[PDB]
Write a protein that binds this ligand. Structure first.
Ligand SMILES: O=C(O)[C@H]1OC(=O)[C@H](O)[C@@H](O)[C@@H]1O
Ligand SMILES: O=C(O)[C@H]1OC(=O)[C@H](O)[C@@H](O)[C@@H]1O
Lengths: 576, 582
């Protein structure tokens, strides 16, 4: 990549300043901002919080549902001491696509709404002065970028997003924004991989810098004591009596990467890492050479009013709830999350399946593939050095039963392999139409993830005993193929309205959610090769309006304000 | 004050760095932190978001309900370029009281959980290195500090907060935290006051600095154009054809305060202000010489999971909801809010009644030894609130109490001291008030004459003669208001609370107490009474939104008198206000 994905830090060599706060904001329904000088300042803005999704602040439909071009602006004072450093704007994300301007100049554009955007403003920045950033953003959905959908035009030119996916089209500046200053020669990337040697461990590494000066790499333990040191951009750190990062029992070392010249230090990058191995052996998932059974949820970045806006408070509550259920894992359904989620999983010992926004899947397919590969490259480069990340999910319910689909996913998986220094497991989640007899893509997967709704979308309610038989029939067919790979259920659930009680149970009641889960567990537990269960969803979350969604999706085990339905105890007791 | 209340800014002279994020946190039930050296680092911390209240993250009762000492820690890199500046830690608040340490050294302590805490770390800060801040906080309630309550000790030594007030005892680092660097000679305070002169206006000002160099004061209009300039620490800016700040139609000038020596500028402070006058004339509240009728709500700093934690998102949603109801006013019930609420009210043209946390002084809810200490606390909080908030055009009145005892001569002497302090600290001498409970009967109350306008909290049709007795409630309400009318006080009355607990989705025909329909009928009855008296000049409903309280048999997941739900969606009664206030 042409920029660094490294999380920003503050030290003697690197500076950072937050641009979070109230920005200026303006909708552009006529698509005239770039024709009308808006990159030099918005003509009639309102205030908009950053980070946040814009939609749920407003009280009128047309602003909530806005689809098209819209603009953000803020001003910031740049300290004089940042003069002739490499100065970057760093956006946690820009959703879905956008162009960044600084002091009236076009800097960069990005497609993909869930990964960092880096804009080099070195040549236009004004140290010791007030500076301006303006972002043009667009949130339309199409079939050449992820996640896929369409854009409908109503009978007055008004656009409406039409997702091919079951989550609301939240957009805007949903993550923190920084301005940062780097040394002219800096650490741009690094990668770590691990090998266990009895009571010792090896940390294999590579470092990419923007120059040719020597690199020194140090490893510090949790209390900051030096435990290993080596020279070179590629090397091995030897760790005596290594304290491994374990499931629900984290330990983090600190890697310290120095660029030196002489004499002195030119740059220093530091990050917490965890020494751990993950591999698939037969039908088992091994973490540090011991089998682990995945227990947890698919989540969303979703909270009242903020939308997908990042807040550490949502992270804290959600992890306390996860721990209370005795979970050990979640999937970042259906897009990479803010970086802070992974930082915290590293601290709490949670396992993450990191998912690219390949959901909602012609002459457009070659362009779509380019987008998909780009998002995959960015995700893996950003997230690879988190110990929590133990697998990549490269799709959620695509078509997989044609040879075309096979050729498409071969390319995606090939790109993922070249970018992951650790070569950790790659998978994706399959929908039911990917029949064991028809699917051509499951052979690309290190382990297989199934989304299934036997007892909800298939033979629900009075037909639940038929649903169980259909489920066992399918699992028997998978069993008979003897693939010798682990299966993980990445989705199963029922919409459940908090407070809806019925005896005997009905679809949508709290009691049916319990009974459905119990049926599913009986099926899971009947097959040796099932090695994980991630329920859909951790919490009720927002979707597009329609006749099948009663204020979003209610398959949460928790409510949207993070309180447990009756089924939450069922998980807690089972996962204990 | 031994520090500045001024909101931090970033420019050539002043630097700031946010310390918001995930801090380290540890409960201290045995009160061993200081004797164990925790000011040098917490031994077994968990992560805690800042800004936020700590309580609602946890899944266990004892952590949620924790009462006592607890500690926060974070680390921050200080730029080398901040050396030889005055370096301060600035906490938007520390709830309720705490002691700030930096690099292991005790810096300052503060009591009062809703106003800024400034800690001068100049002598211990290490520029060009990682620095440490540790804060010891306590969230107990007592009768010598605001807001008042008690602390109960359970059999095993565990403490439980017992408020004398109807809101949950949220605490922690609930607002943003910064480390800032100021020049050695800086602008510490300033005050503005306005006079209207035809199409023109005067901006009277005073500036307090930490040195003796000359001061230049400039006023810029909303596009940055210079409209007035003068010299001196006291002066008058003359503004031709002034664009006044108006209700729901703001205009903000920018005041620029410079300290200079012979070789240039030493400090620059900049803030948006609005040219407007507020006064009481007979029963009228006059804004820019025209009567205004107050329409709006009591609020709270309260939101799911964050508790009282500040977030601009809550500000944005709440103001959109306020504007949709056609409101023009809120009261900061029952404590000063984060500064950002006032900044935004200034932009949106909302009127604010700014309230000090003098709540929980009721004798019934709750002896001659504690009142003098309480008075000192009350006056300190008043001084800090007014110094912090005086230059916001939105702030048009100070509320100095919510439902204290007022029927004794001693209560009069107490409040005379508070009002006198407030007068001393407010350069504008703007209207002062407090909200009275029903026990402050017109025949008994000794304190309403201290007020420039009278704020009443009344629940005729809820706590008094509710439900099937609502016709009696109306008669009792009219009886009381007829008594006030016959006193002919010639002051405005504002209803600062009236409402009914209302469960979203509870519908009944005919209505019952707790239903959405009864909330509507109650409000209609109250409006009929309000509109029967000339001297009523405002109505602020209780509450804008459902909010958290102490658990109990009278609170069904907090207080449900909101017109909006806690996640900020309208109950049926919200339309009733929208239509009336249009
Ligand atoms: O229908 C549902 O509830 C879910 O179904 C799925 O197949 C999707 O992967 C998930 O995103 C939806 O939310
Ligand atoms: O009882 C109520 O709902 C309210 O009554 C009041 O008198 C208090 O001033 C207020 O803080 C309570 O919440």
């Amino acid at each position: 990549l042409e920029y660094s994905e490294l999380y920003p830090i503050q030290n003697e060599y690197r500076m950072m300043q937050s641009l979070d706060g109230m920005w200026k904001f303006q909708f552009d329904p006529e698509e005239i901002g770039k024709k009308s000088g808006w990159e030099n300042g918005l003509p009639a803005p309102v205030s908009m919080p950053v980070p946040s999704s814009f939609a749920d602040f407003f009280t009128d439909h047309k602003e909530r549902d806005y689809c098209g071009d819209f603009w953000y602006e803020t001003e910031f004072y740049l300290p004089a001491e940042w003069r002739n450093k490499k100065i970057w704007l760093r956006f946690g994300s820009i959703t879905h696509r956008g162009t960044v301007y600084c002091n009236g100049m076009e800097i960069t554009s990005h497609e993909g709404g869930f990964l960092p955007v880096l804009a080099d403003i070195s040549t236009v920045a004004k140290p010791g002065q007030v500076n301006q950033v303006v972002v043009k953003i667009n949130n339309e959905l199409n079939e050449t970028s992820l996640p896929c959908g369409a854009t409908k035009i109503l009978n007055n030119g008004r656009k409406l997003a039409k997702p091919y996916f079951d989550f609301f089209n939240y957009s805007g500046l949903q993550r923190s924004v920084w301005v940062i200053a780097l040394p002219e020669e800096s650490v741009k990337d690094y990668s770590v991989d691990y090998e266990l040697c009895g009571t010792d461990a090896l940390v294999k590494y590579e470092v990419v810098t923007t120059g040719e000066h020597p690199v020194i790499v140090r490893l510090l333990d949790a209390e900051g004591e030096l435990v290993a040191e080596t020279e070179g951009k590629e090397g091995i750190l030897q760790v005596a009596n290594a304290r491994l990062w374990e499931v629900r029992n984290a330990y983090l070392y600190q890697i310290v990467i120095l660029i030196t010249d002489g004499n002195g230090v030119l740059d220093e990058y530091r990050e917490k890492i965890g020494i751990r191995t993950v591999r698939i052996e037969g039908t088992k998932i091994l973490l540090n050479d011991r089998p682990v059974y995945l227990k947890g949820f698919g989540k969303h970045e979703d909270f009242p009013i903020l939308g997908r806006g990042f807040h550490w408070g949502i992270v804290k509550r959600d992890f306390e709830c996860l721990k209370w259920t005795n979970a050990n894992c979640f999937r970042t359904s259906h897009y990479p999350y803010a970086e802070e989620w992974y930082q915290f999983a590293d601290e709490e010992g949670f396992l993450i399946i990191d998912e690219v926004p390949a959901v909602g899947m012609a002459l457009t397919v070659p362009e779509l593939l380019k987008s998909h590969i780009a998002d995959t490259e960015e995700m893996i480069t950003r997230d690879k050095n988190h110990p929590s990340v133990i697998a990549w999910s490269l799709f959620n319910e695509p078509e997989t039963i044609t040879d075309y689909a096979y050729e498409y996913f071969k390319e995606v998986f090939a790109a993922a392999e070249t970018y992951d220094f650790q070569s950790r497991p790659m998978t994706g989640a399959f929908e039911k139409n990917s029949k064991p007899e028809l699917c051509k893509c499951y052979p690309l997967c290190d382990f297989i993830c199934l989304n299934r709704y036997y007892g909800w979308y298939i033979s629900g309610g009075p037909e639940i005993e038929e649903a169980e038989e259909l489920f066992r029939d399918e699992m028997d067919r998978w069993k008979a193929k003897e693939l010798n790979v682990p299966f993980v259920f990445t989705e199963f659930g029922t919409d459940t309205m908090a407070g809806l009680h019925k005896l005997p149970s009905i679809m949508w009641s709290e009691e049916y959610q319990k009974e459905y889960l119990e049926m599913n567990f009986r099926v899971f537990d009947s097959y040796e090769f099932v090695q994980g269960e991630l329920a859909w969803n951790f919490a009720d979350f927002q979707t597009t309006e329609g006749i099948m969604r009663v204020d979003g999706n209610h398959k949460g085990v928790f409510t949207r304000d993070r309180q447990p339905k009756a089924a939450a105890v069922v998980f807690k007791d089972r996962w204990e």
